[PDB]
Structure formats: structure tokens, C-alpha cells
């Protein structure tokens, strides 16, 4: 285990069905920075 920031998804029931690991790669970083699992086509600023 390592200290990290995750984004967890709770579904209609109370069960966690998906997650995003914010440190996996730049796309995951962008997903965590906009707090959404889906991204539209375009160019986005990420962290320095």
C-alpha cells in the first residue's frame, strides 16, 4: 500500500463499483481534477 488520492463511485445502491487512481497517469490526474469519470474532446490544463 501507498498513500494516494482515490475517487470512488457509489451507485444507486450503497456499493462501490468503480474508482479512479489519481496518480496513475495524466488522464487520471485530469479526471480527478475535474471530478468526473468522463471527459469531452479538447485540451485541458493539468497540474504543474
Amino acid at each position: 500500500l501507498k498513500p494516494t488520492t482515490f475517487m470512488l463511485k457509489y451507485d444507486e445502491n450503497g456499493t462501490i463499483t468503480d474508482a479512479v487512481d489519481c496518480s496513475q497517469n495524466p488522464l487520471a490526474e485530469l479526471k480527478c481534477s475535474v471530478k468526473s469519470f468522463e471527459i469531452d474532446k479538447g485540451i485541458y490544463q493539468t497540474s504543474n
Binding site: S33, Q45, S47, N48
Partner: protein
Amino acid sequence: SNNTIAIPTNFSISITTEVMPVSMAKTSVDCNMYICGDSTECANLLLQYGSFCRQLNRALSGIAAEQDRNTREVFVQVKQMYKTPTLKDFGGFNFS
């Protein structure tokens, strides 16, 4: 008066300038960098304020897009890239 008029008999050609701003600098901010630097303790404490930073960056990105929109609206008003003529005389009017 009531019975006389004044009529010009000559004229002059006048050219004047008008300066107009169009666009300003586009900027972006890294909240974590600005507020916490490289401190992991501060970074962890900052997590409960993500909404405010997302709001700030949304505003800034909107401004950034608007700047390019302004420049395009002002300058892109022709469909054909007309070539510069080789002879710049035009009947005595020096365009060079």
C-alpha cells in the same frame, strides 16, 4: 444670418488614428502549488476545498477561451487570403 450662405471652395484629405484593445493575457493557476508549495501536510488539509478551486479554474479557462474568440472575431473577416500585389502604385496613391 437670414439671406446669405457660406460654401467651401477647397478641401483637404485627413488621416487619423484610432487605437483599440482586443485581447489580454490568458492565465492559469495551480491551487496546490500557490497555497501549499511542496508540503504534503498542507496538500492533505487542502483537499476539503476542491470545489472552490474548481470554480476558480473554470472562471479562468472561460476567460482564456474568450480571448482567442475576441481575436478571431476582430481579424478573421475574409474568406480568401488575397495576395499582396507586386506593384503598389495605384494611380499615385503610395501604399508601400
